[PDB]
Amino acid sequence: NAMYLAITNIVESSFFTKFITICIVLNTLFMAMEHHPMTEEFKNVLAIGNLVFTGIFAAEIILRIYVHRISFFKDPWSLFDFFVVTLSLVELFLADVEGLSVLRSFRLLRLFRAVTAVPQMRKIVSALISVIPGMLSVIALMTLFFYIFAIMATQLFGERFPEWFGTLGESFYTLFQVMTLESWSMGIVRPLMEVYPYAWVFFIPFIFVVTFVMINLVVAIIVDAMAIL
Amino acid sequence: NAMYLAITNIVESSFFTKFITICIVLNTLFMAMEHHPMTEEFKNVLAIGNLVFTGIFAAEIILRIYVHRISFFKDPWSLFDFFVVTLSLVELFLADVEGLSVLRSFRLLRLFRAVTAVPQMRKIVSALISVIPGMLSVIALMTLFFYIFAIMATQLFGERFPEWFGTLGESFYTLFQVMTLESWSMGIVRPLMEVYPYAWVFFIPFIFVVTFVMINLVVAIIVDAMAIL
Amino acid sequence: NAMYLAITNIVESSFFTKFITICIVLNTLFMAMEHHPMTEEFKNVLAIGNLVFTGIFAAEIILRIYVHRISFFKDPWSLFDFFVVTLSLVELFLADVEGLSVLRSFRLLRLFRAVTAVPQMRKIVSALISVIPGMLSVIALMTLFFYIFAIMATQLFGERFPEWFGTLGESFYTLFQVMTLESWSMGIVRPLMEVYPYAWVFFIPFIFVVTFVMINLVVAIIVDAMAIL
Amino acid sequence: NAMYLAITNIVESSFFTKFITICIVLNTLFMAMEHHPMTEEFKNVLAIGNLVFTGIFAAEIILRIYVHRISFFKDPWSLFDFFVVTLSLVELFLADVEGLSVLRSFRLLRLFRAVTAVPQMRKIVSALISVIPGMLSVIALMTLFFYIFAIMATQLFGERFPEWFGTLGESFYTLFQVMTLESWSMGIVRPLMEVYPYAWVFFIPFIFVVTFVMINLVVAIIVDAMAIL
Amino acid sequence: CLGIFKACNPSNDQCCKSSKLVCSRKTRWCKWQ
Amino acid sequence: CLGIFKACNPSNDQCCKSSKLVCSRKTRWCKWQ
Amino acid sequence: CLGIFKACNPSNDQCCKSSKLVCSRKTRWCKWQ
Amino acid sequence: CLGIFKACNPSNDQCCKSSKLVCSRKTRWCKWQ
DSSP states (O other): OHHHHHHHHHHHOHHHHHHHHHHHHHHHHHHTTOOSSOOHHHHHHHHHHHHHHHHHHHHHHHHHHHHOSSHHHHSHHHHHHHHHHHHHHHHTTTOOOSSGGGGGGGGGGGTHHHHTTSHHHHHHHHHHHHHHHHHHHHHHHHHHHHHHHHHHHHHHSTTTOHHHHSSSHHHHHHHHHHHTTSSIIIIIIHHHHTTOTTSHHHHHHHHHHHHHHHHHHHHHHHHHHHHHO | OHHHHHHHHHHHOHHHHHHHHHHHHHHHHHHTTOOSSOOHHHHHHHHHHHHHHHHHHHHHHHHHHHHOSSHHHHSHHHHHHHHHHHHHHHHTTTOOOSSGGGGGGGGGGGTHHHHTTSHHHHHHHHHHHHHHHHHHHHHHHHHHHHHHHHHHHHHHSTTTOHHHHSSSHHHHHHHHHHHTTSSIIIIIIHHHHTTOTTSHHHHHHHHHHHHHHHHHHHHHHHHHHHHHO | OHHHHHHHHHHHOHHHHHHHHHHHHHHHHHHTTOOSSOOHHHHHHHHHHHHHHHHHHHHHHHHHHHHOSSHHHHSHHHHHHHHHHHHHHHHTTTOOOSSGGGGGGGGGGGTHHHHTTSHHHHHHHHHHHHHHHHHHHHHHHHHHHHHHHHHHHHHHSTTTOHHHHSSSHHHHHHHHHHHTTSSIIIIIIHHHHTTOTTSHHHHHHHHHHHHHHHHHHHHHHHHHHHHHO | OHHHHHHHHHHHOHHHHHHHHHHHHHHHHHHTTOOSSOOHHHHHHHHHHHHHHHHHHHHHHHHHHHHOSSHHHHSHHHHHHHHHHHHHHHHTTTOOOSSGGGGGGGGGGGTHHHHTTSHHHHHHHHHHHHHHHHHHHHHHHHHHHHHHHHHHHHHHSTTTOHHHHSSSHHHHHHHHHHHTTSSIIIIIIHHHHTTOTTSHHHHHHHHHHHHHHHHHHHHHHHHHHHHHO | OOOSSOBOOGGGOOSOGGGOEEEOTTTOBEEEO | OOOSSOBOOGGGOOSOGGGOEEEOTTTOBEEEO | OOOSSOBOOGGGOOSOGGGOEEEOTTTOBEEEO | OOOSSOBOOGGGOOSOGGGOEEEOTTTOBEEEO
16 A cells, blocks of 8 residues: 555645646636637647647546545545546547537636635635525426416417427527516517517516516525624 | 215325326426427327316316315315316316416416425525515505506607507506616617607606616515514 | 684595595596597597696695695695696696696605505605615716716717717717616627727726626615614 | 925815816816817817816826825825826827826716715715625636636637637627626527527526626625624 | 307317307317307 | 687697797697797 | 548548548547437 | 927828828827827
8 A cells, every 4th residue: 555645645745736726727728729710730739738638637537546446436526527527538439529528627616616715705605505405496496487387388379489489498498588588578579469469468477476586586695694694 | 974074084185185286297297298299180189188187177176165165265275276277167168268277287386385395495485475465565656656657658759659658558568668677778768869859868767766666676575584584 | 714724624634635636546547548549529528637637736736825825835745746736737838848747647646655554665665765865875976987987988989970979968878778788789889899899898897887886776775674673 | 394395285285185176077077078069179179178187187296296205105096196197198198098098087086085975975985895805706706607608608609600709709708798688589599599409508507607696796795784784 | 050069170160150169279179259 | 819828729720820839739729839 | 441539631531431420620530420 | 200299180190100190180199009
């Protein structure tokens, strides 16, 4: 276990770990060299740079598993790192990854684990981690509201125009559009008033109930800071 | 009263009642089989499925009234269930129900009576039920504001374009559009500045007063969580 | 002073005063008979109804001043009533009143003096009356921000298009439009990026500072309910 | 040091200092005489008025430095005044200052140092000065979110239309547009659904996470008023 | 005429037209308008 | 001329044109512009 | 055919077409669709 | 050439063109671009 613990100490060395994060932020700046005026000859060195960056990450994870069998695997953060670099390797395995490879850009969020050092950000991150479950519950209830309302809508207005309400997928997307108060009037509801003169009585109570629910979300976001302090 | 109380116990059996809610959520998924690429031959089995679903609900309510004469009728929740399945039966009685039949989709909100089991959702539902009356009062006052402002608007701008301000119904809808901050400038007020150069002095104080009133609504939504805790 | 105090008691009789408010709400419903499908023959009875409604209000105020010389005139509410019915009489005096006559619709706000009887609305009206002065101060500061920013804008972008920034009146209106987050991108700033590629660095900090100031307004609206309770 | 302290007393005389602020607000009204219907002959007196206004400010600062060597230079407010009038002098030194000269309009914010005299505005300015650093931190984190998301977007949707996502500058501006809930549906995402039917699954979680972060900003703005009182 | 509550097809609707009844395409039965 | 405060119709307006008066369609009387 | 993981150019792609492989312009290698 | 800081009119600009100077319409003087 001699070189095991020795090189394992070099793994847990902050020089190495912070070097990995410098490689991470340098990889993100390497993706910030995704211009369109890049040249095709300089594109090949960009490709081999992505190659060697992903190789460095794969080397990092094969060392982290050469130490840990299941101990890192209990930790979901390590599972997140392993999962995203293996998805980068499936990008390196003939798959139609669109851009999911630079989901490893999300590895930059480990710098988030250093940005908490501002004394307000401690309260902010404890607050966000505290309000995750209640927000998941209000996402559930608001999606239920969307579910019944979009079913009503796609039965109602399916015929004269199915571009907005033909399926349930596109009717559901359309009610997310009318949720965020953008062109429901000029883009959506005024074409309905051109045909159906009694759909404003559908849409206006929908605006009230989901403005209600979203403001309720804001309230259950508010409560944490008076809960802590 | 022997088989009365026996089958009444089977009514109050949670196997039966939760079975009714499973039939409810399965009916909503049956309406989630409202695609457009459904076939006409498969549409007839959808019709008989709606037939038998509504039959199951009608059977449920005729048993619930075979037990209870007026005791369930004091409870407004039972009145809601009875009312919506009878409206489904008026859909089953030659009426021009557009889609009001799947107002029985709202019966899925009884699952809401199980979703309160998350400990934050207890406070959330007590909060919403607590803030119903004050919100009804602020709806009343904001509608009064809309009433006087829309009367002023439909007297002012009725002539040169009545598409937005001819009646009181469409002028009132137009001021609901200018309430929610969507294309008041590009869609509405800039056409008025093409004709009347002194209507921005009408519209801007309206935006201030109803942004004021809506933020006041948000405040009286806020107050409940500090009232309870 | 005999018939003076006797008929003055009949003035302060709630039968009479509430009768005036019933005449008020009936006048507003009379203006709610401003349809476009009203007929020209029925328009003349609408005109004489407006005539006799304004006559009733003028009779009300001449009695209220036959009692009170300056005592009602110290009260600004009485001054508001007198002022708006005299403006209705200037409408009845050959003036180009557009629709300022049905500023007497605002007399319906005396019903607001009865709607406070809901126990939350007491706190609501005390809250609004409490937060009037601080909101006047934040209107002053935000208008100062608008003043310097619109001066900068109307010097900057006056030349290539003066429809949005030629004067200070229309540039000031344009920055109120960009304040409320509506078509600044598609309607406004993307035409500027067609000409000036360095005006987003003008507009984005403006969005930050006035989103800041408006949220600060929401905070100073919040503070009253924790101040009272 | 005799005339030194004597004329220095005349500098610190409130008659003089408030006279400078009157010259400031008169200069801003002089820029409020930037109409388009100004005449070319009257434009020359406007030019010499800007000349003499900037001369008065330059005279003010040369006296303020004839008193103070480094003592005013420790104060950043004096550095702000000196910096903006020297930038006005670089405008008076053949430079392509677009309109940065009337950045001296920001000198009107010294009137802000008198507007705090309303008793709510004391709490308001202490509140804003208190919440500056936490807001700087949340600007940092939200810009990090924008950074990774815009990198993903400009790799994803660069090809079929680069008007919105070709570079990182314009893709970053486009995600600021989709941040503020304006024409993401009609102007942006529905053209993407015309080509890529799986980008709504990109955009909708982005709307959730940055609506989350902006509401968190509103919360950390809220906390100050309960912190002080 | 054809009575109330009688099954049919919208393609070959044959309801009691006199009483404003038409076989709906979704319902497949004569609705009373 | 026709005086001040005098009833009329906008279709056959006959106000004192010299003093910028016109029978309004809503008011049915000569307004002073 | 040309195997799996084999370098190429999109301009002169020569992957094993039978197995739905094409030399991508960004990757410069045959991707499995 | 015409020197630095010299008054002029944009309509008849006569600045030292060699040093990228033009009489601005708002400034009425040769600006250094």
